[PDB]
Amino acid sequence: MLAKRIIACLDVKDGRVVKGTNFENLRDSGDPVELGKFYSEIGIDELVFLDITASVEKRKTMLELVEKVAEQIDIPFTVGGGIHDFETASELILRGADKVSINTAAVENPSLITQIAQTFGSQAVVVAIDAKRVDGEFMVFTYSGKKNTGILLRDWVVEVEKRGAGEILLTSIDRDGTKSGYDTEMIRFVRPLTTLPIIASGGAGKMEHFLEAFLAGADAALAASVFHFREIDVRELKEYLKKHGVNVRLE
């Protein structure tokens, strides 16, 4: 549908939620599987798990996470963090993930988008784009924000859709980590350039920020610590959005 989605992002490392949560009701407030299940039960529409485990155990660790998450939830989930090639993406989808997120590897080899899409469908391929204003232009950054690629956001969005991606996870480096709001200027910039769903990421601090993101043209809104630390309640968020005319899924 044209229903707007609320997505929780769980940063994970060695099978734990990085920085934990304030959910004292859980058996283990830092267990990403139990946390993901909890979120599915309280109204989150999809999950994104981003792993930062050391290379040696990373492959096994991501596969174990996917297997364990898949048995507990029925809502869509994406896995990402250091997916560099088709075989890695393939194993993760087969083990249970609905989608994979790719970022630096896609920029370095855009054919990777097409390669994954040809087997798993475009809907399986989320391209995460991290962008920042530099000298008055929106530029694409790789390596967790460390590298200005010199590629314009405008050009890369178009290329990503051409290559067969299914969704764009758009993170503003200028808002990420803050609580001042989503980068609606950046969302509005991207919206006319692509037909793909856009997941807004970075800057959420209060319920109103979600409304603003949707008005800007996002199809989904992603957040992490605002949910994990109970600054925003998911059901209350959905109530609020529905009240103000946004098409959310609200049972």
From Swiss-Prot:
EC class? lyase
Tell me the function of this protein.
Answer: IGPS catalyzes the conversion of PRFAR and glutamine to IGP, AICAR and glutamate. The HisF subunit catalyzes the cyclization activity that produces IGP and AICAR from PRFAR using the ammonia provided by the HisH subunit.
Q: In which pathway does it act?
A: Amino-acid biosynthesis; L-histidine biosynthesis; L-histidine from 5-phospho-alpha-D-ribose 1-diphosphate: step 5/9
Q: How does it assemble?
A: Heterodimer of HisH and HisF.
Q: What is this protein called?
A: Imidazole glycerol phosphate synthase subunit HisF
What HAMAP family does the record point to?
Answer: HisF (MF_01013)
Q: Which species does this protein come from?
A: Thermotoga maritima (strain ATCC 43589 / DSM 3109 / JCM 10099 / NBRC 100826 / MSB8)
- What EC number(s) does its UniProt record assign? 4.3.2.10
InterPro entries cross-referenced by the UniProt entry: Aldolase_TIM, His_biosynth, HisF, IGPS_HisA/HisF, RibuloseP-bd_barrel
The effect annotated for residue 103 to A is: No change in activity
Output the Gene Ontology cellular-component terms.
cytoplasm
Q: Could you tell me where this protein is found in the cell?
A: Cytoplasm
Name the GO terms of the biological process aspect: L-histidine biosynthetic process
Task: Name the gene that codes for it.
Answer: hisF
Q: Where is the active site?
A: 11, 130
The alphabetized UniProt keywords are:
Amino-acid biosynthesis, Cytoplasm, Histidine biosynthesis, Lyase
